[PDB]
Amino acid sequence: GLPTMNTPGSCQFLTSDDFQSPSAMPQYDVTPEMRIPGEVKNLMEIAEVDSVVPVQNVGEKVNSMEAYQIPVRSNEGSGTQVFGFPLQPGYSSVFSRTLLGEILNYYTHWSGSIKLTFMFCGSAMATGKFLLAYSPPGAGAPTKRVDAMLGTHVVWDVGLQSSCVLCIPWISQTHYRYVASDEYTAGGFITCWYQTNIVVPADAQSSCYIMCFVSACNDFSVRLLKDTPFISQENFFQ
Amino acid sequence: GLPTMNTPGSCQFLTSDDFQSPSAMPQYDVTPEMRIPGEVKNLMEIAEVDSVVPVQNVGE
Amino acid sequence: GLPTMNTPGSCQFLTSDDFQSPSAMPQYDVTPEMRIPGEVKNLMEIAEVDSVVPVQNVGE
Amino acid sequence: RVADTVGTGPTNSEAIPALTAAETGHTSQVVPSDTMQTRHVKNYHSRSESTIENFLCRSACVYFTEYENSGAKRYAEWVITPRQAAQLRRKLEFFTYVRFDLELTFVITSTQQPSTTQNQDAQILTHQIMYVPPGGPVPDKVDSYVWQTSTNPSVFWTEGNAPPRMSVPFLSIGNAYSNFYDGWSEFSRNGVYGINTLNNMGTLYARHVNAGSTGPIKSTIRIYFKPKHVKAWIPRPPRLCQYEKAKNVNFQPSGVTTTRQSITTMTNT
Amino acid sequence: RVADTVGTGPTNSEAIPALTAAETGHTSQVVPSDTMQTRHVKNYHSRSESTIENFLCRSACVYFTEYENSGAKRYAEWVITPRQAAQLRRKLEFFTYVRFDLELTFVITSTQQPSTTQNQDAQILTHQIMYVPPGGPVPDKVDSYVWQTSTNPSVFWTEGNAPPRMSVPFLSIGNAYSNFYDGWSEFSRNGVYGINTLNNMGTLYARHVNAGSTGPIKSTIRIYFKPKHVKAWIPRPPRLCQYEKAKNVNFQPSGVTTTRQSITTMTNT
Amino acid sequence: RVADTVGTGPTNSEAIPALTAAETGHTSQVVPSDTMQTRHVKNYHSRSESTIENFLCRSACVYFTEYENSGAKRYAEWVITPRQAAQLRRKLEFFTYVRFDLELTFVITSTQQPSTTQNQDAQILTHQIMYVPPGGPVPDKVDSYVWQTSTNPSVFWTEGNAPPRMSVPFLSIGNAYSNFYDGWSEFSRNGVYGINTLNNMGTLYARHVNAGSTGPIKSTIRIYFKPKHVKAWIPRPPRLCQYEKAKNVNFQPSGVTTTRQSITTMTNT
Amino acid sequence: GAQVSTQKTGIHYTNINYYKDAASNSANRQDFTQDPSKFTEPVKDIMIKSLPALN
Amino acid sequence: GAQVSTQKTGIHYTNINYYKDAASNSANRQDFTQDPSKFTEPVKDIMIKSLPALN
Amino acid sequence: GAQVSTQKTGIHYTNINYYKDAASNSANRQDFTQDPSKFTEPVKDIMIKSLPALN
Amino acid sequence: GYSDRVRSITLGNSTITTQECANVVVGYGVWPDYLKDSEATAEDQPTQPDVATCRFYTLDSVQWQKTSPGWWWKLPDALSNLGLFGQNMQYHYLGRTGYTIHVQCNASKFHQGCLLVVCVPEAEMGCATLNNTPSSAELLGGDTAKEFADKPVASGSNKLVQRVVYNAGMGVGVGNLTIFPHQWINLRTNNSATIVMPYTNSVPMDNMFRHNNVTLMVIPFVPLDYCPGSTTYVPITVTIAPMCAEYNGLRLAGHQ
Amino acid sequence: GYSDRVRSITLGNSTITTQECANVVVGYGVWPDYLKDSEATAEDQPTQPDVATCRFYTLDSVQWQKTSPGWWWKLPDALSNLGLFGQNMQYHYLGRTGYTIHVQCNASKFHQGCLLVVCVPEAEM
Numbered sequence A: 001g002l003p004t005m006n007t008p009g010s011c012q013f014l015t016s017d018d019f020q021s022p023s024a025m026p027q028y029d030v031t032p033e034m035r036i037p038g039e040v041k042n043l044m045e046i047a048e049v050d051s052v053v054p055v056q057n058v059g060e061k062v063n064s065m066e067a068y069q070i071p072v073r074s075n076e077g078s079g080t081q082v083f084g085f086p087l088q089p090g091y092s093s094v095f096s097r098t099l100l101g102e103i104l105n106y107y108t109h110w111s112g113s114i115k116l117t118f119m120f121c122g123s124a125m126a127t128g129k130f131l132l133a134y135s136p137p138g139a140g141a142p143t144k145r146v147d148a149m150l151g152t153h154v155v156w157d158v159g160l161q162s163s164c165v166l167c168i169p170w171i172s173q174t175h176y177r178y179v180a181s182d183e184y185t186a187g188g189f190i191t192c193w194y195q196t197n198i199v200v201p202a203d204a205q206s207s208c209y210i211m212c213f214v215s216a217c218n219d220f221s222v223r224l225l226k227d228t229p230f231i232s233q234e235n236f237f238q
Numbered sequence B, C: 001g002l003p004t005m006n007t008p009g010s011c012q013f014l015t016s017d018d019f020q021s022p023s024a025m026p027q028y029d030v031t032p033e034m035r036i037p038g039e040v041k042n043l044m045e046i047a048e049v050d051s052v053v054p055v056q057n058v059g060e
Numbered sequence D, E, F: 001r002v003a004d005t006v007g008t009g010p011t012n013s014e015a016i017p018a019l020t021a022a023e024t025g026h027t028s029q030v031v032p033s034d035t036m037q038t039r040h041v042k043n044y045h046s047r048s049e050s051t052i053e054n055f056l057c058r059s060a061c062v063y064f065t066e067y068e069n070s071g072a073k074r075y076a077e078w079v080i081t082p083r084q085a086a087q088l089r090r091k092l093e094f095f096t097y098v099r100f101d102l103e104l105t106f107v108i109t110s111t112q113q114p115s116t117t118q119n120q121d122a123q124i125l126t127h128q129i130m131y132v133p134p135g136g137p138v139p140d141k142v143d144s145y146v147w148q149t150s151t152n153p154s155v156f157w158t159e160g161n162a163p164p165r166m167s168v169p170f171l172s173i174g175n176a177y178s179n180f181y182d183g184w185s186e187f188s189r190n191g192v193y194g195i196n197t198l199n200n201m202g203t204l205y206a207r208h209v210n211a212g213s214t215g216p217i218k219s220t221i222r223i224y225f226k227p228k229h230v231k232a233w234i235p236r237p238p239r240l241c242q243y244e245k246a247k248n249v250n251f252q253p254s255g256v257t258t259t260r261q262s263i264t265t266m267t268n269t
Numbered sequence G, H, I: 001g002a003q004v005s006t007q008k009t010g011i012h013y014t015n016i017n018y019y020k021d022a023a024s025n026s027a028n029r030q031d032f033t034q035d036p037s038k039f040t041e042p043v044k045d046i047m048i049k050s051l052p053a054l055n
Numbered sequence J: 001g002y003s004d005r006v007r008s009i010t011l012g013n014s015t016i017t018t019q020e021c022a023n024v025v026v027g028y029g030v031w032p033d034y035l036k037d038s039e040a041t042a043e044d045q046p047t048q049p050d051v052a053t054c055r056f057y058t059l060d061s062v063q064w065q066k067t068s069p070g071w072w073w074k075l076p077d078a079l080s081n082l083g084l085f086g087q088n089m090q091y092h093y094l095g096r097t098g099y100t101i102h103v104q105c106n107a108s109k110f111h112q113g114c115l116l117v118v119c120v121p122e123a124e125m126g127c128a129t130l131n132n133t134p135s136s137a138e139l140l141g142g143d144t145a146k147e148f149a150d151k152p153v154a155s156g157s158n159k160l161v162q163r164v165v166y167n168a169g170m171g172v173g174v175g176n177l178t179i180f181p182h183q184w185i186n187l188r189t190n191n192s193a194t195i196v197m198p199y200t201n202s203v204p205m206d207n208m209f210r211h212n213n214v215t216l217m218v219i220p221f222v223p224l225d226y227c228p229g230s231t232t233y234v235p236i237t238v239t240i241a242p243m244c245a246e247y248n249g250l251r252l253a254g255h256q
Numbered sequence K: 001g002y003s004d005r006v007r008s009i010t011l012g013n014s015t016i017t018t019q020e021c022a023n024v025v026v027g028y029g030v031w032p033d034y035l036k037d038s039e040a041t042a043e044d045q046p047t048q049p050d051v052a053t054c055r056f057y058t059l060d061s062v063q064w065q066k067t068s069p070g071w072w073w074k075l076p077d078a079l080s081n082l083g084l085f086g087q088n089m090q091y092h093y094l095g096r097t098g099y100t101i102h103v104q105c106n107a108s109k110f111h112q113g114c115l116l117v118v119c120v121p122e123a124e125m
């Protein structure tokens, strides 16, 4: 009869506890393992994979493959804005439903760099240069290419290498950021501008499309696990 | 008074649990064993033995 | 089934107790430390610092 | 741990870490250091909380039913499936095949019921939860011989105690639990289609061993599942559309994301 | 573990692993490799869950009775036998002689009873379970001196606590428990016939140490048996016919199996 | 330990341990030995109980709310802040930045409520406390799917047991918790001003898993915070004025101290 | 005086007993010993598979 | 037969198991192994960053 | 993997931790480290007691 | 004198050339192979036809239009009628294979467009009518491409697959299909996509009629376009080649 | 797998890619650098902003027409209003810089033309 004494916490069921429980099926022989391809070991192996970003949310294109297409056209001037969305991988309607944004919605904090791979889907005869830029928060979003200028940019020349990767660094006051929005934890703006208008020959289409892909860099990490707001339920499914 | 803390599962009776219980009959001397023929050690020793199959179930 | 026996004090919550509790957030990675100036280690480091005394309490 | 950034300076070469051909089906590995001047930063950040075990290993309620002290509903039964709850089902469905051990915790709670019954003075209720593997005899009443559990495992738990908990092995016939199944159960490509052709975990019955009082009492057993020692293969897109059935992929089409106005709008609408 | 299959090729000899004479009373040992071309397969399958200990070592309810707060049934008594329950009895009867230790768990549950009794406010009920080995004095009332258990073992258990459990040795006089007995108790080949000539384990009495309240309360003690450290000899055919008595083999004849139509019908009817 | 006094004798030199210039912003280090003849005394006095851990590491109630068995208030919610209680808030505010682990103990207590309801015979109440990190779905009713806590951590506790307790890590984004913040949340120096721009710990919901009885019952959850493994930087003046808000420094001006009469009065008035 | 044995797999689990009686001990779940040639093949003269049973 | 392992930090925690089945053991929270070049870069011919993907 | 440390006096108390997270550990009551010359004397040039502060 | 753009794949009687391509995307980093004695259950010796089964089977061509939503081909069922792959598949209870999927589509310098060529392991699809499950004739199309829908399929009392491309008939986001081994046929830089799929399944071998373990999907993310004069008929031809096909459990032929 | 046609120049926040080009023509064979103690006169210590000043400033685009004669941009004055290069330039009496001038113009295979991109030291007009 060993003298024991209980501490607060006895007979409590903590959802996230880690204890040993007696097996209900003793000496049960588990069917031997099999090497099945593509095993996941960490959720970041999945967030490091490019997934097409629905930049053109706009209207009913969200109910289509058009959400995925970024319209590019031959103008009568350069410096025009192609697109613009804020750096909120788990919050912005653009990123929230990406492979990266879905995983990020199960966590409260996040930290790291992100790769935005842009692929030009025009004719093999179309040319053009684009200014892909990321401007940290502090002063509003760049409204001219001349304001996007001063930011962290990458001039993309369309050629044989269809795609160009604008890599967004981690420039933050804090170590992590909230997955949900908070202006303390503000992220910045990603904009695209024509550097030199789209030039096409005669008989080739002048309006093309670009596609954007989002993946995490080797320094990306998510913290504090919570439930996604993306899956609801009214009754047990039957 | 050793500080302890109970985990879920306390005072539960699992039909298939495997624990130690105090003997109700202490220092009881069990009648010695005897070698009796045909001891079974596994149920598969029995399933490896031919038994006549009722193929002609049919009717009565 | 190890024979145990509780001593008075079981299931009591002492405001000043010092026990281990299960973490509600497992394998959680804490934001790394930073050297911030002027760390206090004992409250007497603060009581050893001169502070102006309001001798002329008197009235208003 | 997470990778530290390397101190980078200017560049003027024909090396193009930024230009690629995404058609290859290969994700680019560009890092800040490649498209800008970086400073050296030492990353101590850890990807510990995003391992598959930490993601899935948390008790989730998968279902719950009620049984009573008297009447018709005197015992309950549930054919085991993790698909009746939106929350846990969706996490498991990030992977095509998952393999794991389970930790079962049950939260059994009773409520006194409205009656004209006078002089109620309940006695402590003890409950019995019994598992009937696919093939065994099923309780047809609160008192069929079936509840002897001579071989079936079952938990007897008296109210007011800590929640009954036990763990279970990887009970599958396959070398991994199949989360999806693009097939039928019949070789004639007929019968059932989908994962239900695979679900055969048996039923779970619960009952009051004793009625306890003269007045009515209704109990509600909540079953919690916690995947311990998890292995997951072949990842897939998280569920977009809401779940409609507990036995099939049936969804009602929904748009890719929510909307905003112009491709230039820095704000969700 | 289970035996792996050997890779086999074609054959054309006078060696006949398939032809035998089953009259010998010897089971053939042919394996797939003998009557076909086999591939090498490595069997990791284990016969762990079919050992006699795993088969029999699970708590089964063997019997249960009731006693009350007031009235005539104030204490209960049960002459110990594993033969009153169909489930555990049938498993033990796969063998002629069995030898083992026992683990006894009791699930005692009370229910408030209907009365005109006003102002009921029950106090906690404590129960006493007492074993009277063959020969000792038997309780003739809830209060006979017998309940002192100065030498008889007995469990005192207060409601709301974990189920009272204790283990017992191999209490037989023989070097093994006899499951069957083709004989009589009298040398004149008379008197009792069968296993009852052998059953002499004594009685088990239970009672409320206290009444607790002014209103009526009825309790139901469920006795669970779990054969630990089991040894079983001379196996036999599992019971086909249903059990009719708790003291004898008495069965009512039933057919060999269920039926189907033609010997060619690939389906049960 | 504390420093022992050195035996001192008379002195007649130009060494002036007593005369200084306090304008330097340096506290004098004069000790009795310097301005008088001291005796040697050996100090065994220890400053153990004044370490920051001993000061802060004691469970303090930081808040408490109520929820009911029926009606509108069937579940509760609290946005986490240590600033609603005067006592613990003031101790933490002796420092500008604090870093620590937390130990959460909850004291959940129920009270039967006045009703015309006859034949009440309550069943044991089990409570669920759930944490919703900033961003997760929030319970909009006692029964929204949200309470499944498939990923959110939550404690299920049955009444009459020891107080539910668990510890939490240093959940901040910054390398230390900021107790004060002289800034805004918007770069346009607008929006929120002060510490609330920083508070984003999420909400805490509690509910009765079961109603238990026919009559009304109201519960009161008390949340206790205990800073374990504490680090505190940049100390500051203890709070003089009383607290007015839980989100800001807002105080109502009060005098430096209490009063007495003449600067010569050896007694408080 | 503990005993570390193996767990059932596809580790170890230390065990100590507290009771003075062997009957108070846990079940013996890990005895996978087996011998079907008591029942399968209880013949006096050996029967070889590849040979004719009756010769 | 105990096992002292490391705690999650930014010490040790001794552990012993009492159950005969590996299924009765605690979760495996400390496996930070990882390999994204199954998904990121499942290409047959190697793709070097600094070089043109299509040449 | 236990740790025997000293008790507060004017003996020892053995301790083992059971949890995988350092946050689950007991408070650190025995750290009597101290350094008031951050606050008392944060002056750039050293100030000796026996000497005139302003010279 | 080399080029990352050139290729030649020889399997059996068939050889395949490409003068413009990306790498060969190898399954989950796994190249197909046979079943090991360690991972085997079926004790009977397998038939491994080799050159007769593991060769290039070119199914029917499909037309890429400015309005085509996408297409899908279940995998064992596509080649279920083709040559000796289809035969062994009928006489045998169990089967196991991997594939080399070569999707071909050539346009010109004045044409534009971009297709996603994925290999979805276990593409369990949904029904238009929530209560039912799609019919075998609605999910499967032997060598004849089954096609996605431009807009939501009506939920009557049918067993129609819910074909809206943007949900891929699986209730997911079509833009995340990128986790499953894939390639793109951007007409600007590409000419074809090659994907070498290893055997993905939770059992060592499975029946080839009852279960279609992989589903090939060709969904155009950026539509075909061209100025007038530029040739209008742009076909897509699918060529699949089984790899390391074994068959256990021989009996009479069929499925029932 | 290389090409004389591909390029990538990283300076500060900015990176510049080219998929068709000639070599980089380096000034008079001289690559820009800082002033030596041997060649210095101003005795005060300089401000060398680094990543803030020496980065890619993209001025306004101009349209090449079938009738355009040419264009010219003076050098310190062009970036005199751009970012922190323009700021330091205003607060300081003396300054010294070199440049990486990237003129961009893409047409198609059916377009023709040819521009002279010069850097005239001291273009006194």
Ligand SMILES: CCCCCCCCCCCCCCCC(=O)O
Pocket: A024, D080, D081, D082, D102, D104, D129, D130, D131, D153, D154, D155, D168, D171, D177, D178, D195, D198, D199, D200, D201, D204
């Ligand atoms: C009292 C004993 C209770 C035993 C509980 C057994 C529960 C079995 C759990 C099976 C787990 C998840 C499996 C999904 C099955 C499938 O779709 O293949």
Ligand SMILES: CCCCCCCCCCCCCCCC(=O)O
Pocket: B024, E080, E081, E082, E102, E104, E129, E130, E131, E153, E154, E155, E168, E171, E177, E178, E195, E198, E199, E200, E201, E204
């Ligand atoms: C409170 C102490 C209770 C002791 C319980 C003793 C029960 C004895 C069990 C005997 C076991 C099975 C024997 C069948 C007997 C026979 O037929 O020979």
Ligand SMILES: CCCCCCCCCCCCCCCC(=O)O
Pocket: C024, F080, F081, F082, F102, F104, F129, F130, F131, F153, F154, F155, F168, F171, F177, F178, F195, F198, F199, F200, F201, F204
């Ligand atoms: C059931 C899980 C409950 C989890 C309890 C989590 C409570 C978080 C405590 C945060 C602590 C003190 C912080 C003040 C925050 C700030 O102002 O920055």
Ligand SMILES: *C(=O)CCCCCCCCCCCCC
Pocket: C002, C003, G001, G002, G016, G017, G018, G019
């Ligand atoms: C051999 O056992 C020496 C090691 C002892 C370890 C501590 C034992 C834990 C409690 C056992 C007491 C026995 C209960 C009757």
Ligand SMILES: *C(=O)CCCCCCCCCCCCC
Pocket: G002, G014, G015, G016, H001, H002, H016, H017, H018, H019
């Ligand atoms: C290896 O464990 C030897 C040291 C034993 C330490 C005492 C064990 C504490 C109680 C363990 C009993 C196991 C429970 C089934």
Ligand SMILES: *C(=O)CCCCCCCCCCCCC
Pocket: H002, H014, H015, H016, I001, I002, I016, I017, I018, I019
């Ligand atoms: C180092 O600890 C070896 C000595 C072990 C002494 C027995 C431990 C007592 C029980 C510990 C189990 C840990 C609880 C998770």
